[PDB]
């Protein structure tokens, strides 16, 4: 029992990570920030509070 | 006992066709632009 | 401390996502992105809809 | 005492590697402590007055 | 039982077409051949030696080359069709687009080379620049 | 599909996503370059009635997508994360969330470029972003900012990929593999990781200061304040020169692998070639300003730079001699990856020697920023990226997915795309040697026939790509029917002409790569016990 | 490159000595034909004896074809003629006079 | 439920069941039973003489014939092990695919390999 | 992640189902690919 679990978890320092949404949410946040800054510095709306919230 | 070759005989009889074929290949690969130049109205012909 | 071992045992017993640490924060943050980013990216292409169509054809 | 049918992943025997690794760990710790103390001493001796000047 | 002089339809079938027969009597015939080979050769007849050479040498399956029994003809036909299709599509799209250029016509080139002669430009070269009707 | 694909954390399931993104980007870019070539077939506004800014933006999109958005995810990311952890024998790469965030940070770059081209402003300053042309003085609108964010996200993804490759190679390599027996492709990708690591920060910082100049009403490199854009152009060339090695070195590794396996003989002094790639990577930093001879710097500096270039040229020639010795004195099977490798070793070598001739300090007076340089780099980009990707696909596709491809279709596809590439890129050197300018929607009426032949070759190439995507469709839909019949080759290794075929049943696929000895693709967390080499 | 033939030759006969089945015979034959070293008639006779021990005449056909065409050797023939006739009439393995006229 | 000493490596059930008690103030705890993660399985072992992920190569010198084929310990169904000749590096880098039922050979090396798994129910 | 055979799960495709015989998806791949060049040409000028 000990040998099989040691071999199956020894060279595997990576957890069985759940469907973590970190990459998609961080990519979505960066894209929103980029497009917001591009639209605000020179565009149609000069809004500043909501880009600060982003 | 040096049977047959005499390297020169087979050497020439084998490379001469190959070098001729390669020269023809290069001639075609350089004459296709020449063929285009001839076919096009380069001299109003 | 006095809560680390018990919390680890509970987590091992209940193999569930969200890591149990910040459920309220996750429930607060999940709808905010959908409410904010979608509604701020829709104008980006909605406003130039009338602006679009400049052919500038010349002859 | 978890069961083990044939072997509990025994691997290599308890050779001289155990005391070698212990000696490596203690040598690393002693080196870190000695270098920290020596740097503190040379700092409070000459480096700190020079920095203050 | 170490049959001797296996002169049957199996040997000619093996030499004629091996892949055709349905991969089931293969084990039987090769086992018989090896059983004969266990005893000394004693001048094997032509069909048996031909059969064992065909089995062991190849010209089938793994020994079948990347070039098939004449698919190079298909390759040539396909490449010719590809060139024809590409040139036809380019011709039709260029016809659809049309031309709206006020030069490349003969008069422009003749005036250009007349001015080139007047200014004496590129004397050791080609004064004619037409390239089109 | 969202539960496992959109939320993946597996290199196995993300390599195919990399491949799909790469092929989609490549086909879109080929269609868009088709548009670019078609509007340039004849002088005038044949298809683009005015608005040369549109042509400029089209060119910028083409170059950017070809450089950072098509080939980088394919051989760096897509091939690396499906070959390196597999060849190592480790179950999974270290912290695959790096790979996931590197993958997911791409698409908004595509959407920002498409929306920047959609707006009237556009980014029409070339793929180079030399100031002040990209600033508010000439090009306004968010297009510049969107392109800057796209290159920033691509750089971050490349850095993360290099992080994962470096950590996987150095920290959890298998016991059997050591320093003196490590294969070629992984050495190539590790050296590329070094070069990427040492090249990304300079572009990041310099482009950050350009953005700050555009925003903070300041100018560090623009003349409005006393700055000089020459400094930024040194920095940009310092980044750019290692980039071509970054995109060409994994190609070198895969080409070495395929020629070594297809010659039925081992490598020719693997130590010599790995030293050659290491020397190339280390010497890539000595020519940081070799691309900018046009200013008129001191003669000693130009002599030093041309000496550095001629020194850099030597390892490439030695490595070419290494492939030539590898293919010499060995059995040859004319399979399609070998055809790609041969086309590489011919045309890439010719392009590289032409560039070596161009590497002269005083020779930029006639060729720089002309069609000669585009004829130069199109050669190497096609050889080391397009053909290298085709070879890798046709060389691992039957096993990485279990689906075979039509050999006849592959042969006709290679022939079509090879002849198309030749007939497209050859006349460009004749345009360049005359002294024609670059990046102009309209040109004088001297070289119209060459533009026409380039256009017909482009149509041949796009028809070849259509045939290629049809081949992908057929492989994905009729792999089972193709495996049973004689439509394709099921053993890339014909048995030696001394051995019987019946013994060959146990000797199916034997080479110097472990993933070939694997069965049909198993679960992601395979490799329960790491491989050991005696 | 200044490599003695005797060492590898003796290695070849020693390997053929313990020829339990055809696998080691085939691998050693492939190794021998891998070098530019043209096999001696002695090692060829040893290989044929081992093939007789393992009882596979097609292996003898393959090795005879390999000796007929392995390297150009300036197109030497009489050497091939003697090196084939000695081993054909030493014991008798009639195989060449059949595949050619077929 | 509570802290586990885990002094021996044959008395731990569950990798996460052991965290490692520490000290808040005073002196540093000794690096024996105060590590979080499976790191103790290797550090305590190498403290007592047990190594992890052995790099020892197999018997390259032995040719592994049918009488005494070499033995590789792997409880998995398949294995990726091969031969490099009698010395460390002699011929091309190569490996085999041993399986539970039949065997495999090293081709040009001729080193017959065998898969030897531990008994399983 | 260990519940997949290792045959067709590596691609986001599905043979089963009459919604798409791998033709609607393939045509859609052409559509999404050819979007950017033609829309880029069309937004400021003619095709
Ligand atoms: C235009 C339509 C072209 C269809 C070609 C069909 C030819 C054929 O049978 O299969 C060729 C080939 C399959 O052949 P295979 O299964 O390998 O059979 C060969 C045997 O092994 C060995 O058999 P073989 O070598 O004896 O066969 C080759 C022989 C003569 O070989 C050829 O002529 C070579 C043709 C290959 C290129 C196809 C160009 C046509 O037969 C033909 O191919 C018939 C020639 C006339 C066909 C003209 C159509 O591929 C196709 O099935 C089509 C290839 C792609 C062409 C376009 C497909 C239609 C597109 C419709 C419009 C869609 C627009 C996009 C919408 C979004
Ligand atoms: C990946 C690199 C790559 C590729 C494939 C191409 C493909 C082509 N390129 Fe381009 N090009 C560049 C990289 C590339 N280019 C760069 C970096 C610039 C710089 C911009 C500048 O200089 O200012 C440039 C600029 C450039 C110009 C400058 C235009 C101007 O002066 O403004 C021209 C026109 O002369 C041109 C022509 C072509 C043509 C006809 C093809 C044709 O070959 C298109 C047909 C396609 C192929 C034959 C290859 C197939 C492509 C694939 C993606 C296959 C898909 C499958 C896989 C990837 C597995 N390219
Ligand atoms: C795939 C990408 C790639 C690769 C591999 C290369 C490889 C090389 N490149 Fe190029 N290059 C580009 C992509 C690439 N390049 C791009 C995108 C530009 C910019 C164009 C633009 O600005 O628009 C450029 C520009 C560029 C310039 C300036 C032109 C300019 O842009 O204005 C020069 C000249 O100095 C040059 C030289 C070389 C040399 C010498 C090699 C060599 O490393 C080639 C290696 C191969 C060989 C050298 C073959 C081996 C030779 C031998 C067999 C030995 C013979 C010689 C000796 C005796 C040693 N390149
Ligand atoms: C400026 C552009 C010109 C462009 C000119 C284009 C010409 C037309 C295309 C020619 C391309 C040559 C390769 C054709 C593909 C092919 O299959 O080649 C191999 C064939 C072998 O023969 P096969 O086609 O398989 O038919 C065999 C028939 N059996 C054996 C039953 C009797 O063997 C052959 O086809 C013959 C040998 C090839 C020799 C190549 C060298 C060139 C000389 C060829 C001379 C004869 C053909 C041309 C006659 C006009
Ligand atoms: C069914 C529909 C058929 C439609 C046929 C249309 C034919 C046609 O339009 O004429 C033939 C074309 C003309 O080419 P174009 O570009 O449309 O017209 C010339 C424009 N100038 C020269 C002023 C720049 O000429 C060409 O396209 C020539 C193509 C190149 C030659 C191919 C040769 C292939 C073998 C080598
Ligand atoms: C198909 C094979 C791949 C393309 C090879 C040719 C590309 C070069 C080219 O297509 O050249 C095109 C040039 C034309 O040049 P042009 O300026 O007169 O075209 C302006 C007028 N349209 O000659 C040709 O039309 C040659 C045509 C074939 C001649 C041989 C057969 C004669 C019957
Ligand atoms: C218009 C025609 C255009 C050409 C059409 C070709 C159709 C396919 C012909 C064919 O496949 O030819 C088939 C023939 C033999 O077929 P076979 O006689 O053995 O078939 C007999 C049994 N049925 O092999 C060849 O030619 C091989 C030619 C070389 C192929 C590999 C090329 C590698 C890259 C070369 C370029 C790299 C640079 C090298 C330096 C320049
Ligand atoms: C294919 C290559 C054709 C080259 C070519 O057709 O070239 C055009 C030349 C003459 O046009 P040009 O060169 O004098 O034009 C010079 C200035 N632009 O010949 C022809 O029109 C021959 C016409 C052949 C028509 C083929 C039938 C097509 C279907 C017609 C259905 C209606
Ligand atoms: Cu450079």
Going from N- to C-terminal start, the domains of chain G cover 1-102
DSSP secondary structure, F270-288, as one string: HHHHHHHHHHHHHHTTTTT
* Technique behind the model: cryo-EM
Q: How far apart (Å, rounded) are the C-alpha atoms in residues E61 and E133?
A: 59
Respond yes or no: is residue F316 known to be catalytic: yes
F460 is a domain residue? yes
Choose the final residue of a domain: H55, H72, H96: H55
Answer whether D52 touches H (CB < 8 Å). no
Interchain pair A3, H10: CB under 8 A: no
Which residues are within 8 A (CB) of H55 and not within 5 positions of it... i.e. 6 or more apart? F175, F176
* Cα–Cα distances in angstroms (integers) from residue H15 to residues A3, C14, F145, F269, in the given order: 13, 15, 49, 46
Which two tokens mark F158?
Answer: 């490349």
Query: Which residues, listed in sequence order, are joined to residue F273 by a DSSP beta bridge?
Result: none
- Asked whether the beta carbons of H28 and H34 are under 8 A apart, the reply is no
What's the resolution in A?
A: 3.2
Name the nearest CA neighbour of G55 among G13, G25, G96, G97: G25
Picking from C50, C55, C57, C58 by the largest number of I CB atoms within 10 A of its own CB, the best residue to mutate is C55
Q: Three-state DSSP class for F92?
A: coil
- DSSP structural state of residue H22: -
Residue among F40, F381, F436 to mutate when testing ligand 2 (max atoms within 8 A of CB): F381
CA distances from C25 to C35, C36, H40 (A): 16, 17, 34
Proximal ligand: closest to the CA of F455: 2
Residue H116, helix vs strand vs coil: strand
Q: Which residues contact F155 (CB under 8 A, 6 or more apart)?
A: F200, F203, F204
Please give the torsion angle defined by the CA atoms of residues H41, H44, H47 and H52, in that order, rounded to the nearest 10 degrees. 0
Tokens of F499: 């051995």
Query: Nearest 5 degrees, angle CA E14-CA E20-CA E24?
Result: 75
- Tell me if H34 is assigned to a ligand binding site: no
Closest CA to F60 of F128, F132, F111, F114: F128
F453 CB within 6 A, ligand 6: yes
User: F147, F123 in Cβ contact below 8 A?
Assistant: yes
Q: Is the CB of F342 under 6 A from ligand 7?
A: yes
Q: Please check whether residues H61 and H49 belong to one and the same domain.
A: no
Q: What is the domain count for chain I?
A: 1
Dmax over CA atoms of chain A, in Å, equals 66
With a CB cutoff of 8 Å and minimum separation 6, the contacts of F261 are: F492, F511, F512, F513
Residue pointed to by tokens 């030759």: G9
Distance of CA C23 to the CA centre of its chain: 15
- With an 8 Å Cβ cutoff, the interface of chain H facing chain F consists of 53-55, 57-60, 72, 74-76, 78-84, 89, 92-97, 104-105, 107
* H83 labeled binding residue: yes
Cβ proximity of H98 and G12 under 8 Å: no
Residue G59 near residue E56 (C-beta atoms within 8 A):
yes
Question: Which residues lie closer than 8 Å to F151 by C-beta, 6 or more apart?
Answer: F64, F68, F203, F207
Backbone angles phi, psi at D11, to 5 degrees: 65, -145
Q: Please report, for the domain that includes residue F475, its CATH number.
A: 1.20.210.10
Q: Do the Cβ atoms of F145 and A41 come closer than 8 Å?
A: yes
Residues 6+ apart with CB under 8 A from F370: F431, F432, F435, F436, F437, F438
Identify the residue whose C-alpha is closest to ligand 3 atom 37: F355
| Whether residue H76 sits in one domain with residue H44 | no
Contact C56 I46 (CB under 8 A): no
Using DSSP's 3-state secondary structure scheme, residue H72 falls into strand
Cβ contact F285:F353 at 8 Å: no
By residue range, what is the domain housing residue F336?
11-517
Domain ranges across chain A: 1-54
Long-range contact list for H87-92, CB < 8 A, 24+ apart?
Answer: H87/H60, H88/H57, H88/H60, H89/F180, H89/F181, H92/F266, H92/F512
Q: Is E133 in the pocket of ligand 8 (CB under 6 A)?
A: yes
Judged by DSSP in three states, D26 sits in helix
Question: F23-59 in b/e burial notation, b at 16+ Cβ within 10 A?
Answer: bebbbbbbbbbbbbbbbbbbbbbbbbbbbebbbbbbb
Lookup: tokens for F170: 């150095």
Nearest alpha-carbon partner for F454 in F33, F177, F41:
F41
C-alpha span between F518 and F509 (Å, rounded): 9
Half-sphere exposure of A33 (CA within 13 A, CB side): 13
Ligand closest to CA E94? 5
Burial environment of residue E129 by CB neighbours within 10 A (0 to 12, 13 to 18, 19 or more): middle
Residues in chain F: 534
E50-87: b (≥16 Cβ within 10 Å) or e: bbbbbbbbbeeebebebbbeebeeebeebbeebbeebe
Show Cβ contacts of residue E96 under 8 Å, excluding neighbours closer than 6 positions.
none
Residue I46: list chain F partners with CB under 8 A. 49
Residue in this structure with the two tokens 């691998």, named with its chain if needed: G27
Q: Identify the H or E element spanning F357.
A: helix F349-358
Rounded-to-integer distance, Cα B19 and Cα B22, Å: 5
Flag whether F530 is in a domain.
no
Residue corresponding to tokens 């006992």: B1
Cα atoms in the Cβ-side hemisphere of radius 13 Å centred on F147 = 27
Question: Exposed, middle or buried: residue E120 (CB in 10 Å: 0-12, 13-18, 19+)?
Answer: exposed
Written as one string, the DSSP assignment of F472-492 is: HHHHHHHHHHHHHSTTS-S-S
CA-CA distance, E58 to E81, in Å (whole number)?
Answer: 34
Nearest-Cα residue of chain F relative to residue A35:
F146
Please give the Cα distance from F125 to F139 (Å, whole number). Answer: 8
Please say whether the dihedral angle defined by the alpha carbons of residues F168, F174, F180 and F185, taken in this order, is positive or negative. negative
Using alpha carbons, select from F442, F46, C56, F109 the residue that is nearest to residue I43.
C56
The response to whether residue E72 sits with its C-beta less than 6 Å from ligand 4 reads: yes
Residues having CB within 6 Å of any atom of ligand 5:
E 87, 91-92, 94-95, 99, 104, 132; F 42, 456
Distance CA E18, CA F251 (A): 43
Sign of CA dihedral B35, B36, B37, B43: positive
Q: Give the whole-angstrom CA distance, residue I47 versus residue I38.
A: 7
> Token digits for G13?
């006969």
Measured CA to CA, the distance from residue H79 to residue H104 in angstroms comes to 11
The burial of G49, by beta-carbon neighbours within 10 Å (0-12 exposed, 13-18 middle, 19 or more buried), is given as: middle
- F439 belongs to the catalytic site: no
Angular region, C11: left φ>0, alpha ψ -120 to 50, beta rest: alpha
**Structural domain of I16:** 1-47
- DSSP state letters, chain E: ---SS--SHHHHHHHH-TTTS-SSSHHHHHHHHHHHHHS--S---HHHHHHHHHHHH-SSGGGS-SS-SSHHHHHHHHHHHHHHHHHHHHHHHHHHH----S-SSHHHHHHHHHHHHHHT-STTS--------
Of all ligands present, the nearest one to the C-alpha of E91 is 5
C-alpha angle F293-F298-F304 in degrees, rounded to nearest 5: 75
CA gap F376, F387 in Å, rounded: 16
- Taking CA atoms, D31 is separated from D17, D45, F233, H43, H47, in Å, by 21, 21, 48, 20, 20
Give me the residue spans of the domains in chain B. 1-45
In the set F12, F173, F214, F241, the catalytic residue is: F241
Q: Tell whether C58 lies on the interface with F, counting CB pairs under 8 A.
A: yes
Query: What is the rounded distance in angstroms from the CA atom of residue F396 to the CA atom of residue F400?
Result: 6
Is F279 annotated in the active site? no
Range of the domain at H22: 1-55
For chain F, the domain total comes to 1
* Number of domains observed in the structure of chain H: 2
Indicate whether residue F59 lines ligand 2 (CB < 6 A). yes
Rg (CA), chain E: 36
Annotated catalytic residue, options F9, F52, F91, F92: F92
Determine the longest span between alpha carbons in chain H, in angstroms: 65
| Closest C-alpha to H95, from H106, H108, H82, H104 | H82
Q: Separation of F288 CA from ligand 9 center, angstroms?
A: 7
> Which residues lie below 8 Å from residue F233, measured CB to CB, with a gap of 6+?
F130, F292
Catalytic residue among F143, F169, F256, F336: F256
Q: List, in sequence order, every beta strand (DSSP E) within F256-358.
A: none
Looking at beta carbons, which residues of chain F come within 8 Å of H59? Answer: 534
Structure tokens at F279: 């020397």
Q: What are phi and psi of H112, to 5 degrees?
A: -75, 130
Q: Is I10 helix (H, G, I), strand (E, B) or coil?
A: coil
**F323 has catalytic annotation:** no
Cα angle value F90/F509/H92 (rounded, 5°)? 70
Q: Which two tokens stand for residue F410?
A: 């592959």
Instruction: Specify the residue for token string 């623009």.
Output: F222
Burial G12-45 (b: 16+ CB within 10 A, else e): bbebbeebeebbbbbbbbbbbbeeeebbeeebbb
CA distance I45 to chain C (A): 5
User: Torsion angle, CA of F193/F196/F201/F202, rounded to 10 degrees?
Assistant: 150
Run of H or E residues at H113: strand H112-113
């Amino acid at each position: 029992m000990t040998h099989l679990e040691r071999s199956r978890h020894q060279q595997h320092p990576f957890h069985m990570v759940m469907p973590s949404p970190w990459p998609i949410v961080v990519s979505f946040a960066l894209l929103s920030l980029a497009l917001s800054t591009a639209l605000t510095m020179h565009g149609y709306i000069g809004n500043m509070n909501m880009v600060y919230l982003a | 006992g040096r049977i047959g070759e005499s390297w020169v005989i087979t050497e020439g009889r084998r490379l001469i066709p190959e070098i001729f074929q390669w020269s023809a290949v290069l001639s075609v690969c350089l004459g296709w632009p020449g063929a285009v130049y001839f076919f096009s109205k380069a001299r109003k012909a | 401390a006095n809560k680390v071992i018990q919390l680890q045992k509970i987590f091992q017993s209940s193999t569930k996502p969200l890591w149990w640490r910040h459920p309220r924060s996750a429930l607060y943050l999940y709808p905010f992105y959908a409410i904010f980013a979608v509604a701020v990216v829709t104008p980006l292409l909605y406003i130039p809809n009338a602006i679009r169509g400049i052919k500038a054809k010349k002859a | 005492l978890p069961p083990n049918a044939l072997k509990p992943a025994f691997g290599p025997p308890d050779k001289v590697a155990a005391q070698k690794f212990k000696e490596s760990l203690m040598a690393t710790e002693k080196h870190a402590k000695d270098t920290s103390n020596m740097w503190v001493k040379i700092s409070v001796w000459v480096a700190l007055p020079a920095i203050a000047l | 039982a170490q049959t001797h002089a296996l002169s049957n339809a199996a040997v000619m079938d093996l030499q004629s077409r091996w892949e055709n027969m349905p991969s089931t009597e293969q084990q039987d015939i090769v086992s018989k051949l090896s059983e004969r080979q266990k005893l000394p050769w004693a001048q094997l007849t032509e069909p048996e030696k031909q059969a064992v050479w065909y089995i062991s040498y190849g010209e089938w399956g793994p020994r079948r080359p990347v070039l098939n029994k004449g698919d190079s003809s298909f390759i040539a036909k396909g490449v010719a069709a590809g060139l024809l299709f590409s040139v036809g599509l380019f011709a039709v799209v260029r016809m659809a687009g049309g031309q709206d250029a006020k030069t490349m016509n003969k008069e422009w080139q003749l005036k250009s080379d007349e001015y080139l002669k007047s200014k004496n430009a590129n004397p050791w070269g080609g004064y004619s620049q037409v390239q089109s009707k | 599909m969202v539960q496992r694909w959109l939320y993946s954390t597996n290199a196995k399931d993300i390599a195919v996503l990399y491949f799909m993104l790469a092929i989609f980007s490549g086909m879109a870019g080929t269609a868009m370059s088709l548009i670019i070539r078609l509007e340039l077939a004849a002088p005038g506004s044949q298809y683009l009635h005015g608005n040369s800014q549109l042509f400029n933006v089209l060119v910028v999109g083409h170059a950017v997508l070809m450089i950072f958005f098509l080939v980088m995810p394919a051989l760096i990311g897509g091939f690396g994360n499906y070959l390196l952890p597999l060849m190592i024998g480790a179950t999974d790469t270290a912290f695959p969330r790096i790979n996931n965030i590197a993958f997911w940070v791409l698409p908004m770059g595509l959407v920002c470029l498409v929306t920047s081209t959609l707006v009237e402003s556009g980014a029409g300053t070339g793929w180079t972003v030399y100031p002040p042309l990209s600033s508010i003085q000439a090009h306004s609108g968010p297009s510049v900012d969107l392109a800057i964010f796209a290159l920033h996200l691509t750089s971050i993804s490349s850095l993360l990929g290099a992080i994962n490759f470096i950590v996987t190679t150095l920290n959890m390599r298998t016991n059997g593999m050591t320093m003196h027996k490590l294969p070629l492709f992984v050495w190539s990708i590790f050296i590329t990781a070094f070069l990427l690591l040492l090249s990304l920060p300079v572009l990041s910082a310099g482009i950050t200061m350009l953005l700050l100049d555009r925003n903070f009403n300041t100018s560090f490199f623009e003349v409005s304040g006393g700055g000089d854009p020459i400094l930024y152009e040194h920095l940009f060339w310092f980044f750019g020169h290692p980039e071509v090695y970054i995109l060409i070195i994994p190609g070198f590794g895969i080409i070495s692998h395929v020629v070594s396996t297809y010659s039925k003989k081992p490598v020719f002094g693997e130590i010599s070639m790995v030293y050659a790639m290491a020397s190339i990577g280390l010497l890539g930093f000595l020519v940081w300003s070799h691309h900018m001879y046009i200013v008129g710097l001191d003669a000693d500096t130009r002599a030093y730079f041309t000496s550095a270039t001629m020194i850099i040229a030597i390892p490439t020639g030695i490595k070419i001699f290494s492939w030539l010795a590898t293919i010499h004195g060995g059995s040859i099977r004319l399979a399609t990856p070998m055809l790609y490798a041969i086309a590489f070793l011919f045309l890439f070598t010719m392009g590289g020697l032409t560039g070596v001739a161009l590497a002269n300090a005083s020779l930029d007076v006639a060729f720089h920023d002309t069609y000669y340089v585009v004829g130069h780099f199109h050669y190497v980009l096609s050889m080391g990226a397009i053909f290298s990707l085709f070879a890798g696909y046709y060389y691992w596709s039957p096993q990485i997915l279990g689906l075979n491809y039509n050999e006849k279709l592959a042969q006709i596809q290679f022939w079509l795309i090879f002849i198309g590439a030749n007939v497209i890129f050859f006349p460009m050197h004749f345009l360049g040697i005359n002294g024609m300018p670059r990046r102009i929607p309209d040109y004088p009426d001297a070289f119209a026939g060459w533009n026409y032949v380039a256009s017909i070759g482009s149509f041949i190439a796009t028809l070849s790509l259509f045939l290629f995507i049809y081949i992908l469709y057929d492989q994905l839909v009729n792999g089972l029917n193709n495996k049973v019949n004689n439509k394709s080759v099921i053993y890339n290794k014909a048995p030696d002409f001394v051995e019987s075929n019946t013994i060959f049943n146990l000797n199916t696929v034997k080479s110097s790569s472990i993933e070939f000895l694997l069965t049909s693709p198993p679960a992601v967390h395979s490799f329960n016990t790491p491989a050991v080499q005696s | 490159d200044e490599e003695t033939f005797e060492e590898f030759t003796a290695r070849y006969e020693k390997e053929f000595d313990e020829a339990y089945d055809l696998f080691e015979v085939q691998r050693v034959l492939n190794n021998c034909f891998s070098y530019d070293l043209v096999p001696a008639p002695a090692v060829i006779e040893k290989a044929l004896r081992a093939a007789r021990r393992v009882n596979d005449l097609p292996t003898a056909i393959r090795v005879f074809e390999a000796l007929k065409y392995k390297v150009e050797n300036e197109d030497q023939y009489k050497a091939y003629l003697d090196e084939l006739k000695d081993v054909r009439q030493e014991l008798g393995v009639p195989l060449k006079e059949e595949l050619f006229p077929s | 439920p509570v802290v586990k000493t885990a002094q021996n490596l044959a008395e731990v059930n569950g990798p996460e069941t052991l965290i490692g008690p520490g000290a808040k103030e005073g002196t540093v705890p000794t690096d024996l039973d105060q590590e979080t993660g499976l790191a103790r399985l290797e550090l305590l072992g190498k403290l007592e003489g047990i190594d992890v992920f052995d790099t020892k190569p197999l018997d390259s010198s032995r040719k592994g014939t049918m009488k005494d084929p070499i033995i590789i310990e792997s409880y998995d169904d398949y294995r990726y092990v091969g031969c490099t000749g009698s010395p460390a590096g002699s011929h091309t880098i190569m490996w085999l695919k041993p399986t539970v039922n039949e065997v495999a050979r090293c081709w040009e090396c001729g080193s017959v390999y065998k898969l030897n798994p531990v008994g399983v129910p | 992640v260990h519940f997949k055979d290792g045959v067709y799960e590596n691609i986001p495709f599905k043979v089963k189902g009459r919604k798409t015989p791998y033709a609607l998806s393939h045509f859609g791949f052409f559509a999404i690919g050819f979007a950017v060049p033609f829309v880029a040409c069309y937004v400021q000028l003619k095709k």
